[PDB]
Amino acid sequence: EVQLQESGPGLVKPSETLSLTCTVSGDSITSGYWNWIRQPPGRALEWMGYISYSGSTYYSLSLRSRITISRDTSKNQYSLRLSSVTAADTAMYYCALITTSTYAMDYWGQGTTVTVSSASTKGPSVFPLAPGTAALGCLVKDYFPEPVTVSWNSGALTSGVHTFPAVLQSSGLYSLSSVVTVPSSSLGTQTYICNVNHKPSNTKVDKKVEPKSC
Amino acid sequence: DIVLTQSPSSLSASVGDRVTITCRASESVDGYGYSFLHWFQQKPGKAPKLLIYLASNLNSGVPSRFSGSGSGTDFTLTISSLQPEDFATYYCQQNNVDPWTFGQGTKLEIKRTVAAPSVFIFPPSDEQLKSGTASVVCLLNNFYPREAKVQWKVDNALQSGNSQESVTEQDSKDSTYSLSSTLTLSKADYEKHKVYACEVTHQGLSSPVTKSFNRGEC
Amino acid sequence: QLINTNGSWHIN
């Protein structure tokens, strides 16, 4: 089945150029229309442009002087270039396919977040939230920019997991917790590890959470 | 430029209720016998999923409770009888008039019965303490409605200004919320006091629930 | 199958 995957830096400086790539598997980009869509935090989706199966393009008028969409059929990828960025360009960026089966954006990537900021990237510090039903978790502190993702036991533990929205602290850095509930009887026997991914700094932290004393 | 206006912008409904969302285009999105108006469903943190294409065609794999109607400038998405997993923001999208656009979205919230939170408190880790800051976390798990009050107390002294809250989106299965409240103290301030307590007031609790611990790497 | 040019679908 066709799959789309966005990649590229998660932080770009004001005035500089944003570049992202969409790597396509399971279908050749010599069919369909290959789009970029973005979504600023908490706001509506915005269509930016496409490159078609033939290399023709179609760009949103308001972005024309700043946008390019390119492709490489040998790599089965297409790419977005957006010049002279500002805070208005902070958004989740999606690649999406339109096939002529629907004439609609029928297949989407998972999205990648880009933040426009002069601040430096900073990876998270991860601390345990130590434990019928018991709760445990990880506190993921002091990272920039958003986002972090958290899995448990490499994705094997999904039931009862809650990862909270990040909060901006007064320091200019973000924090969040991820928690899970598990059987109390499993504590001491079953190992629980939170897998924290901070793509903007290409950092991964895997923290084992176990009981303390007091 | 062409504009798509959705109505309403938000709505609350109970499980099994009918849902109707409208999308009005400022000019016709029709061409060659089609209406190039599509409906998407977007769940928290995820890419939009196509529900309805070309105004009235149910996308493959989408439940039959979803349908679309309309022509020209006026369109409707209907969910016949809502399921808990229908919690989402819904968007219309037109791709036949330059420039292509989306509607501003309609947020569907799910109403349900009261559910009391289960409350847990977590002390700061010894490893964090080295750094000179202490985070104390209070978890309120799987409650409804969203409205909740969390009061921190340190050695019975009520705290203010040093806590932040974060709430999940409604659960896709039982429509509940969970919430974290995080109290931030200096290491110095943490080590000068003993009893740390989080007091939770919520409709599902007949009286406030307090969880506490006594400090120290005891 | 319709073709899109400059946002609009047409025969070709």
Side-chain angles (χ1 to χ4, degrees):
Chain A
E1 182 179 21
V2 67
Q3 302 192 78
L4 295 85
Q5 178 66 66
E6 303 83 351
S7 66
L11 181 63
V12 60
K13 293 177 187 298
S15 302
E16 310 209 334
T17 297
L18 179 161
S19 300
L20 294 172
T21 298
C22 186
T23 302
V24 180
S25 65
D27 186 20
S28 173
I29 65 167
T30 58
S31 301
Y33 295 76
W34 302 95
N35 302 261
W36 288 101
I37 300 96
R38 69 181 182 180
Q39 188 165 220
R43 304 298 301 274
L45 296 155
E46 183 190 7
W47 172 86
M48 304 176 74
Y50 73 59
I51 188 159
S52 83
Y53 58 90
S54 73
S56 67
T57 63
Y58 169 47
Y59 300 121
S60 179
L61 178 49
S62 69
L63 297 172
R64 187 70 199 88
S65 75
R66 298 199 297 137
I67 192 167
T68 311
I69 300 170
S70 62
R71 75 182 176 155
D72 184 329
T73 62
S74 78
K75 301 178 182 213
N76 212 48
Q77 71 178 213
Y78 66 112
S79 301
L80 174 66
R81 184 178 188 283
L82 188 71
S83 64
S84 306
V85 296
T86 73
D89 303 305
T90 294
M92 179 72 76
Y93 285 79
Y94 296 102
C95 54
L97 168 62
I98 295 164
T99 77
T100 58
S101 298
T102 63
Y103 300 113
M105 300 166 190
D106 41 10
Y107 302 90
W108 292 65
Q110 44 301 123
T112 195
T113 307
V114 186
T115 299
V116 179
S117 171
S118 61
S120 289
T121 304
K122 186 181 180 303
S125 298
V126 184
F127 302 115
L129 297 168
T133 182
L136 57 96
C138 285
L139 170 63
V140 181
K141 276 220 72 172
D142 295 338
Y143 61 90
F144 187 86
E146 286 204 72
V148 157
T149 67
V150 186
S151 171
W152 285 88
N153 292 345
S154 301
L157 176 59
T158 60
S159 300
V161 172
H162 294 296
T163 300
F164 295 98
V167 170
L168 186 271
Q169 300 165 112
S170 69
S171 61
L173 305 174
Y174 288 97
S175 189
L176 67 71
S177 287
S178 181
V179 301
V180 59
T181 51
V182 304
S184 299
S185 57
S186 80
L187 302 178
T189 66
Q190 278 289 337
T191 61
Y192 296 108
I193 296 72
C194 70
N195 322 108
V196 179
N197 193 188
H198 181 57
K199 292 116 284 85
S201 71
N202 289 287
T203 300
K204 293 183 166 60
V205 183
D206 299 300
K207 186 62 55 163
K208 187 181 218 281
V209 185
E210 54 182 19
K212 210 197 182 191
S213 187
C214 177
Chain B
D1 296 344
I2 180 165
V3 177
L4 298 175
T5 310
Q6 294 179 227
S7 298
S9 292
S10 55
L11 82 87
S12 298
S14 300
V15 177
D17 287 357
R18 185 182 189 77
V19 171
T20 304
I21 300 172
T22 302
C23 181
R24 171 194 254 87
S26 65
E27 65 184 275
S28 177
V29 297
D30 285 12
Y32 297 90
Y34 297 115
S35 294
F36 292 89
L37 193 290
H38 319 283
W39 292 95
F40 291 89
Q41 179 193 61
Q42 189 179 33
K43 297 195 184 176
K46 314 303 282 195
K49 172 182 165 176
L50 179 63
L51 300 169
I52 307 295
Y53 65 94
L54 298 168
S56 62
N57 299 274
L58 187 59
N59 195 30
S60 290
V62 179
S64 55
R65 63 174 176 281
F66 291 95
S67 69
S69 333
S71 201
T73 61
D74 292 293
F75 301 87
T76 307
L77 177 66
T78 303
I79 312 174
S80 65
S81 193
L82 221 43
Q83 298 291 322
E85 66 266 26
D86 296 339
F87 167 81
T89 299
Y90 294 86
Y91 294 94
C92 57
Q93 203 288 130
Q94 74 80 19
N95 69 335
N96 200 44
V97 178
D98 176 47
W100 293 356
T101 61
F102 287 80
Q104 282 290 306
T106 300
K107 196 168 180 202
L108 176 60
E109 294 182 352
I110 309 308
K111 289 183 285 170
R112 54 150 292 156
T113 64
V114 175
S118 299
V119 186
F120 306 84
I121 192 170
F122 300 99
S125 65
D126 292 340
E127 44 260 64
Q128 188 192 15
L129 291 179
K130 294 189 188 83
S131 79
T133 295
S135 297
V136 196
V137 176
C138 186
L139 169 63
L140 284 60
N141 214 27
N142 304 331
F143 62 93
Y144 192 93
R146 197 208 255 104
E147 291 76 32
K149 171 174 184 183
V150 180
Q151 272 271 201
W152 283 98
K153 300 172 180 292
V154 175
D155 277 342
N156 217 13
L158 194 145
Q159 302 298 291
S160 187
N162 55 358
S163 62
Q164 291 191 112
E165 282 183 1
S166 190
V167 184
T168 61
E169 217 77 39
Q170 287 189 266
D171 185 74
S172 71
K173 286 166 44 53
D174 75 0
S175 312
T176 61
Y177 301 91
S178 295
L179 178 156
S180 69
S181 180
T182 306
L183 180 73
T184 303
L185 309 166
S186 158
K187 172 190 183 167
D189 287 12
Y190 180 69
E191 289 178 340
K192 58 164 63 61
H193 302 109
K194 298 174 185 169
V195 184
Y196 291 85
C198 167
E199 179 201 68
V200 174
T201 305
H202 177 87
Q203 187 182 341
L205 300 171
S206 58
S207 185
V209 164
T210 293
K211 297 299 178 189
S212 70
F213 66 88
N214 299 143
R215 184 202 72 218
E217 48 186 279
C218 21
Chain C
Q1 38 283 55
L2 298 169
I3 307 297
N4 195 272
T5 299
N6 194 38
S8 292
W9 297 93
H10 54 97
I11 297 298
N12 255 301

